[PDB]
Design a protein around this ligand. Structure first.
Ligand SMILES: Nc1ncnc2c1ncn2[C@@H]1O[C@H](COP(=O)(O)OP(=O)(O)OP(=O)(O)O)[C@@H](O)[C@H]1O
Ligand SMILES: Nc1ncnc2c1ncn2[C@@H]1O[C@H](COP(=O)(O)OP(=O)(O)OP(=O)(O)O)[C@@H](O)[C@H]1O
Lengths: 73, 248, 70, 370, 377, 239, 237
């Protein structure tokens, strides 16, 4: 989540996040390049990264079901 | 932490809920009594005086409990009404069973055991009422008593419970004389103690309620002094202060 | 009931440096930020005429760098 | 008027402290060294004598070393000294610890031995066996097979003079004493503060036998509670570094730790464990016999009337701390000076106790109830 | 006052003494040649070009410099992605520079071996056995695991009450590891610059990768940002990045490969969920308060050095210790010797320990250990 | 586990709320008891006169029946309830069995009442540790004490309340077969033990004596003073 | 633990019952009691652990008589043991009253266990025994079957034991018992064995005041208060 720390802050990390947003927003209309991203927690992610089309695809991974667990083992 | 249930005991063996209730009695009208040789007296502060309130009810903090006993109540108003009824009931119940007026210490012990029970049982909060008992019994003569929300009771030649109790107790300890109280002198001690404890200036008659219990012709004659009787005592205290002027 | 319309009016009719300085505005994250506001007023009052402060928007504190120990 | 001799002794001592080159070899080194020399880290060592040196500007050029006294002391992480312009290693690496660490070292202890303290004799015995005794007679511990206890915690109510025991240890200790408050690790920068804890310990090891006092340890380590709001104290990281130094891999060599807390329950269990605090010392509020010795010690260097009854003050009032006793003695002297009497009457002591104990109000209705 | 004068006279005598007291070829020819010798500041090459190479180098904070090779150099010797030294005045790569050692990461490696045998640790045979097949047997004899086609856990978390013995076991593994042991300084990983510590964690893995089969001991994992609240204030943002960098390098997109990670925490609950998740740390070896057989063994090992009567019963002493950590049992043995020293008896007796058992446990404000309640008998 | 809840246990195995009740007993005024060949005696302390307060109402030593008397240490009101219930049982035992209550029975009854409060929530364990001293039928003198935990024990001599431990240590050295030799010597042993923890007040003692053939009598203040003076003379003779 | 120990009503995610385990812990606070069952009879030995010289030794009852043929030893809360001991005493007499015969040791152990089981039935005497009892009882008696020793536990679980130990030092005592116990042991041999084990596992020296011994054998009755023979047996050993 963009830090609201006043004055001194981890400004560089926010700049990196903005750079990814700059490429995602109004750019790469060609579908030749696609990006897959993963997070243990989606809560930390800013609403901006998802935006409307910047990262529209969502692939929720559910905890394994009983049938799935037998197969996974 | 160790609050809420009267049942929980703190790591220092302290029942905080009972202690809180005993501290709570402080926010109440001052009630004081003097043993007085040849008499006994109860004096109270009539707080919450307003022009609209009628004050039609005879008394307000002073309730008789028997032909030969009386009490003054300081505490939660509702709890007081519950306790006064039970004290009146215990007094008649003893008379029905033994056909003799209840000895004063016993009426106090019985209410105190009821108050004590509330502290030992989880469901109820400890009573928030503390009261002073004035009466005459053949076994031990004129007596004065104090009850606590904890359920503990004591007999005091003089004591005070509501508002600035410590100030009255300090004034009473110095002024009181053992065996020389002589009722009329005890009434003066009360007016002087009341003036100090009450922040009220001039101790007007409406603010003070005085009840005196005496044994006349073999019959206890509990009487609540009328406003005119209270007024003369106040004027005498004011005149005594005028005599004190210059000399002091 | 008209207290703040009067408060703003005093600022309009004042010849003093009436920086209304509602409690929270240009104020930064701080603990006990009452000094920063008053110190500015003393200097400005000295520069021109005694300055006047109106206390409103009193959310100057409750900042991110804030919280009692427990 | 013997004060003049004492004042002269102090001035003479300061003068003594104030009063505390080779014909060709030194002059050549003086020419070789620059007028300004900048000290920087050594990153890499090369046999050619041109060794990479890291600097604040990060110029890591290999630089030749020509040290007349010795050039074999070069090591990784050593702070080498370089010429301002040429940047060549001038000579033997500078060897000074960080400034914040230097302040802690104490060379002079104002208090004397355990004599000033009275009635904490059991507490004195424990501190001595852990601190003074192992150094004085190392053979006893080896014969028993015991390794001497290295850590002590002094926990007591306010004014029981836990610090006085520490001042007494400073008076009679072979070991260098580093006096650091627990609240002296507030470094704002992320990092640095845990590193400062490492710095204090490395200096203690350098000085060989050393005693570390950490008064008010409650601030540095308490509870080890979770981040919660997310402020993240970073104090927990600092405490963890102290926990690592006391018993976290490696060894503590010969360093002894004395720590003092008004409240011991708040302190986190890991810090207060055998291996970090082998011996625990408790200072209780003084009783009667302990009070008698303290009252005598405080009044020993003042005029005392025969009328004054020291026993009466001690027995009549119970709860006064050792510090409270000293305050009564200072207040009593002031009470007498008001009447212009240098000598102190019994009446003055009685008035003094009342004035000192006016802020201590305790208890509620717990009288009739029990 | 005369005695004070004697000291003042002594000081005056010292003052008189101080005032009265007042009344290699390297420094030769080599210096004359050395002062002219030029410097070559270190820089890192990123690229090379055809014809004139025009290698472009970032100094380390200065700029991308298009520097031609120096006249007295071999073009093949200069390489892309190689540290080099460029003279400022001649603006050319006079000499190439060897790759940076990064010594602080090298320092964390134990190098020395702690002299503690597994025998000294006592009362935790099961905890030792679990560590043996994630630390010693997979490395010493990988063939057995391969025969069942079973991979080693490659990760271990030691958690327990403080003083249980988690670190003591770890030093014992270091004694017989026969592979690089890398103790990690938790404070070192936190750094003033943003993500400077995260760079170090990459270096930690890189050093681990270069050595063949190594165990990394992250003691006090809580210090290494072992939590991920990651609140909006982001006070721990720099450390949180350092923690995530450790997690990814530990596992995901090619993991440790030959690295076994041992992590020890007094509070396991605080550790962040991603680190707790297995694969990063498959085994969860929790150390536990020792049982009566363990309590006797810890007493026997600690007391073997101390001189004592041969008839002492450790079983009784261990029974008297209802729930004692190994450190507290060691504290009883040392305290028992201290009581004998106080009475000046060279050989201690069973009674001395019983006094210590009261002192170490009951005398401490456990409250349960000291009984004033008749309640139960 | 949890301290707050009479019935929750602890991982160590302790009902802490019951132990917290024992604290109220310690804060109570010291009371001592001795078993004499014919004069079981109990001593009390802290008369703590309050100036304008009558002391007939304060009754730390309360008789339960003719052959048995009791001294309570702890919350005053809780003690009043236990004493009255014990008094009713003593009379009931006579109605159910026409024989006077043996001292053990009344201590077992007091223990059972105390245990019943401990067993369930909604009730507070009683904060008293009464000492019961009496002579049973057949003329055997006996002393028993009851803890707030509901346990009961028989003691040759014991102390309860503030500074009980100090009095017991004094009795451990002082209590001897000789000391119980004479009725006065037994009264003296209680006075000497009580004096140690009673401060220098001396007047703040109310020792009561059971003749074991007659009735409980509270000793006169003057009579108590005479014994105190006799003890001082004996101490001077030893010097 | 980690919560779910608030009541016997709650069940652990593991399925364990906390509070019942906590009551099992309370027995450890108790002094060790050792019981050995032999063909000649059952021997019970206990550590009196007298707190003070002044307190009367008889008032601490560690070995009690349930009936002439049955004796019991208790380690754990004193008050809890009393409620269970009274039930066993009423039950043995009630079984005599209804069936004119001596109750078997196993049946008394079963009857006592039935009250112990009601930690929270929610039907029986509501407002009573809301928590598990904290006392482990060793019942040693000679019945029609022969000498029998039975151990009950706070959870209502009872078992016949040739030799058993309860209380603090029970674990140490059991290990010693497995080595010492044999089927042919005489009661006299068992009595010496029990005190020898008790001496090793008790910090105080095994003087006659420290140890209380009890023996029930078919020919005699309870005879479970050896008196002054406590001195005789100890001196011979
Ligand atoms: N004296 C007035 N003459 C004309 N309009 C007025 C007057 N007083 C108030 N009003 C009107 O009422 C509105 C409310 O005033 P205002 O918001 O200042 O009230 P307030 O009680 O001071 O509340 P707050 O402190 O929240 O601002 C004004 O903006 C204006 O429209
Ligand atoms: N099982 C044991 N065998 C031998 N010594 C032990 C044992 N358990 C603890 N100790 C003693 O305790 C100390 C070892 O503590 P260790 O280094 O294991 O750290 P720890 O206190 O368990 O770690 P942490 O502080 O992170 O909880 C040494 O004094 C050691 O002798």
């Amino acid at each position: 989540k963009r830090f609201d720390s006043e004055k001194a802050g981890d400004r560089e990390v926010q700049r990196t996040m903005l750079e990814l947003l700059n490429q995602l927003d109004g750019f790469q209309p060609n579908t030749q390049v696609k990006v897959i991203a993963a997070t243990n927690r989606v809560d930390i992610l800013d609403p901006a990264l998802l935006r409307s089309g910047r990262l529209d695809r969502k692939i929720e991974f559910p905890m394994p079901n009983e049938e799935a667990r037998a197969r996974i083992m | 932490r160790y609050d809420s249930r009267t049942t929980i005991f703190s790591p220092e063996g302290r029942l905080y809920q009972v202690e809180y209730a005993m501290e709570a009695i402080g926010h109440a009208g001052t009630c004081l009594g003097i043993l007085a040789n040849d008499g006994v007296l109860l004096a109270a502060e009539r707080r919450n005086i307003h022009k609209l309130l009628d004050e039609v009810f005879f008394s307000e903090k002073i309730y008789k409990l028997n032909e030969d006993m009386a009490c003054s109540v300081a505490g939660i108003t509702s709890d007081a009404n519950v306790l006064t009824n039970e004290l009146r009931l215990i007094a008649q119940r003893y008379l029905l069973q033994y056909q003799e007026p209840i000895p004063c210490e016993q009426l106090v012990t019985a209410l105190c055991d009821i108050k004590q029970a509330y502290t030992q049982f989880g469901g109820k909060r400890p009573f928030g009422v503390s009261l002073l008992y004035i009466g005459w019994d053949k076994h031990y003569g004129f007596q004065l008593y104090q009850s606590d929300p904890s359920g503990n009771y004591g007999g005091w030649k003089a004591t005070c419970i509501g508002n600035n109790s410590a100030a009255a107790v300090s004034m009473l300890k110095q002024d009181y004389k053992e065996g020389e109280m002589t009722l009329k002198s005890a009434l003066a001690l009360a007016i002087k103690v009341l003036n100090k404890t009450m922040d009220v200036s001039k101790l007007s008659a409406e603010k003070v309620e005085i009840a005196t219990l005496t044994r006349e012709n073999g019959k206890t004659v509990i009487r609540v002094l009328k406003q005119k009787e209270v007024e003369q005592l106040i004027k005498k205290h004011e005149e005594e202060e005028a005599k004190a002027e210059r000399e002091k | 009931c008209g207290k703040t319309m009067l408060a703003k009016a005093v600022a309009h009719h004042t010849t003093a440096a009436f920086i209304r300085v509602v409690g929270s505005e240009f104020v930064q994250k701080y603990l006990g930020e009452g000094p920063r506001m008053v110190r500015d007023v003393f200097r400005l009052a000295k520069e021109n005429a005694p300055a006047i402060i109106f206390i409103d928007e009193i959310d100057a504190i409750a900042t991110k760098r804030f919280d009692a120990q427990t | 008027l013997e004060r003049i001799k004492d004042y002269l002794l102090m001035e003479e001592e300061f003068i003594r402290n104030q009063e505390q080159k080779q014909e060709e070899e030194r002059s050549k080194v003086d020419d070789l060294r620059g007028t300004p020399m900048s000290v920087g880290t050594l990153e890499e060592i090369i046999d050619d004598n041109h060794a990479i040196v890291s600097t604040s500007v990060g110029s890591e050029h290999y630089v030749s070393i020509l040290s007349f006294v010795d050039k074999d002391l070069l090591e990784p992480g050593c702070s080498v000294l370089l010429n301002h312009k040429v940047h060549a290693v001038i000579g033997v690496l500078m060897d000074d610890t960080d400034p914040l660490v230097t302040v802690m070292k104490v060379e002079k202890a104002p208090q004397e031995t355990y004599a000033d303290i009275g009635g904490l004799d059991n507490q004195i015995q424990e501190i001595k066996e852990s601190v003074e005794l192992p150094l004085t007679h190392p053979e006893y511990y080896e014969e028993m097979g015991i390794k001497p206890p290295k850590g002590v915690i002094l926990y007591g109510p306010p004014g029981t003079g836990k610090t006085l025991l520490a001042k007494a240890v400073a008076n009679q200790t072979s070991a260098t004493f580093l006096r650091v408050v627990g609240s002296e690790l507030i470094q704002k920068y992320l990092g640095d503060g845990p590193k400062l804890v490492r710095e204090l310990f490395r200096v203690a090891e350098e000085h060989a036998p050393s005693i570390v006092f950490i008064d008010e340890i409650d601030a540095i380590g308490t509870k080890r509670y979770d981040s919660n709001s997310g402020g993240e104290r970073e104090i927990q990281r600092t405490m963890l570094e102290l926990l690592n130094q006391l018993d976290g891999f490696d060894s503590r060599g010969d360093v002894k730790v004395i720590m003092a807390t008004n409240r011991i329950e708040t302190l986190d269990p890991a810090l207060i464990r055998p291996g970090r605090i082998d011996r625990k010392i408790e200072f209780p509020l003084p009783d009667e016999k302990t009070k008698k010795r303290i009252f005598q010690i405080h009044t020993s260097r003042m005029t005392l009337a025969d009328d004054v009854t020291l026993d009466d003050l001690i027995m009549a009032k119970d709860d006064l701390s050792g510090a409270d006793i000293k305050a009564i003695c200072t207040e009593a002297g002031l009470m007498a000076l008001r009447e212009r009497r240098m000598k102190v009457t019994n009446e003055d002591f009685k008035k003094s106790k009342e004035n000192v104990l006016y802020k201590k109000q305790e208890g509620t209705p717990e009288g009739l109830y029990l | 006052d005369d005695i004070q004068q004697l000291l003042k006279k002594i000081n005056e005598l010292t003052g008189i003494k101080e005032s009265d007291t007042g009344l290699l070829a390297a420094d030769k020819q080599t210096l004359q040649s050395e002062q002219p010798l030029q410097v070559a500041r270190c820089t890192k090459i990123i690229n090379a070009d055809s014809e004139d190479p025009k290698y472009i180098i970032n100094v380390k904070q200065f700029a991308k410099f298009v520097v031609d090779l120096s006249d007295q150099v071999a073009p093949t010797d200069i390489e892309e992605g190689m540290r080099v030294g460029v003279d400022r005045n001649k603006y050319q790569i006079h000499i190439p520079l060897p790759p940076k050692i990064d010594p602080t990461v090298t320092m964390m490696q134990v190098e020395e071996k702690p002299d503690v045998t597994y025998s000294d640790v006592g009362g935790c045979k099961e905890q030792i056995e679990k560590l043996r097949e994630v630390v010693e047997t997979p490395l010493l004899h990988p063939e057995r695991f391969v025969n069942l086609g079973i991979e080693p856990p490659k990760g271990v978390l030691l958690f327990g009450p403080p003083g249980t013995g988690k670190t003591l076991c770890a030093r014992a593994v270091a004694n017989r590891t026969d592979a690089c042991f890398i103790r990690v300084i938790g404070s070192e990983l936190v750094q003033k610059y943003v993500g400077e510590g995260a760079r170090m964690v990459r270096e930690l893995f890189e050093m681990a990768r270069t050595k063949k089969a190594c165990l990394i001991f992250f003691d006090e994992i809580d210090a290494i940002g072992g939590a991920r609240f990651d609140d909006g204030a982001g006070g721990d943002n720099e450390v949180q990045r350092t923690m995530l960098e450790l997690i990814n390098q530990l596992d995901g997109f090619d993991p440790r490969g030959n690295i076994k990670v041992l992590m020890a925490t007094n509070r396991p609950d605080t550790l962040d969920p991603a680190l707790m998740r297995p694969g990063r740390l498959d085994r969860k070896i929790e150390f536990s308060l020792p049982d009566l057989e363990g309590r006797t063994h810890i007493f026997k090992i600690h007391a073997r050095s101390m001189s004592v009567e041969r008839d002492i019963r450790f079983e009784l002493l261990a029974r008297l210790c209802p729930n004692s950590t190994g450190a507290e049992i060691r504290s009883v043995c040392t305290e028992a010797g201290m009581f004998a020293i106080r009475a000046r008896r060279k050989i201690a007796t069973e009674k001395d320990f019983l006094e210590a058992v009261n002192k170490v446990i009951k005398s401490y404000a456990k409250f349960s250990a000291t009984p004033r309640y008749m309640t139960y008998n | 586990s949890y301290d707050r809840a009479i019935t929750v246990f602890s991982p160590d195995g302790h009902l802490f709320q019951v132990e917290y009740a024992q604290e109220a007993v310690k804060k109570g005024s010291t009371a001592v008891g001795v078993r004499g060949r014919d004069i079981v005696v109990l001593g009390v302390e802290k008369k703590s006169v309050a100036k304008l307060q009558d002391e007939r109402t304060v009754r730390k030593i309360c008789a339960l029946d003719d052959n048995v008397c009791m001294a309570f240490a702890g919350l005053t009101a809780d003690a009043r309830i236990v004493i009255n219930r014990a008094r009713v049982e003593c009379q009931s035992h006579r109605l159910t069995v026409e024989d006077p209550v043996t001292v053990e029975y009344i201590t077992r009854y007091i223990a059972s009442l105390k245990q019943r409060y401990t067993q369930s929530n909604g009730r507070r364990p009683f904060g008293i540790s009464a000492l019961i001293v009496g002579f049973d039928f057949d003329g055997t003198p006996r002393l028993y004490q009851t803890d707030p935990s509901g346990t009961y024990h028989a003691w040759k001599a014991n102390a309860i309340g503030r500074g009980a431990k100090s009095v017991r240590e004094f009795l451990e050295k002082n209590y001897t077969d000789e000391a119980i030799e004479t009725d006065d010597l037994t009264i003296k042993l209680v006075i000497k033990a009580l004096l140690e923890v009673v401060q220098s007040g001396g007047k703040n003692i109310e020792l009561a004596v059971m003749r074991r053939d007659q009735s409980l009598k509270i000793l006169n203040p003057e009579e108590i003073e005479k014994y105190v003076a006799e003890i001082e003379k004996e101490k001077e003779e030893n010097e | 633990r980690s919560e779910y120990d608030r009541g016997v009503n709650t069940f652990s995610p593991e399925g364990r019952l906390f509070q019942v385990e906590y009551a099992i812990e309370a027995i450890k606070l108790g002094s060790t009691a050792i019981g050995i069952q032999t063909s000649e009879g059952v021997c019970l030995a206990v550590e009196k652990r007298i707190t003070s010289p002044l307190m009367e030794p008889s008032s601490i009852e560690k070995i009690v008589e349930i009936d002439a043929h049955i004796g019991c030893a208790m380690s754990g809360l004193i008050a809890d043991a009393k409620t269970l001991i009274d039930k066993a005493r009423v039950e043995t007499q009630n079984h005599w009253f209804t069936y004119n015969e001596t109750m078997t040791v196993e049946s008394v152990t079963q009857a006592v266990s039935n009250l112990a089981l009601q930690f929270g039935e929610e039907d029986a005497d509501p407002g009573a025994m809301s928590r598990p009892f904290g006392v482990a009882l060793l019942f040693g008696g000679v019945d029609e079957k022969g000498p029998q020793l039975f151990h009950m536990d706070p959870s209502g679980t009872f078992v016949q034991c040739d030799a058993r130990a309860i209380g603090s030092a029970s674990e140490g005592a059991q290990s010693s018992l497995q080595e010492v116990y044999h089927k042919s042991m005489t009661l006299k041999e068992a009595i010496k064995s029990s005190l020898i084990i008790l001496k090793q596992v008790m910090e105080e020296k095994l003087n006659a005041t420290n140890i209380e011994l009890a023996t029930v054998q078919p020919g005699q009755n309870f005879h479970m208060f050896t008196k002054e023979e406590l001195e005789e047996v100890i001196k011979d050993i």
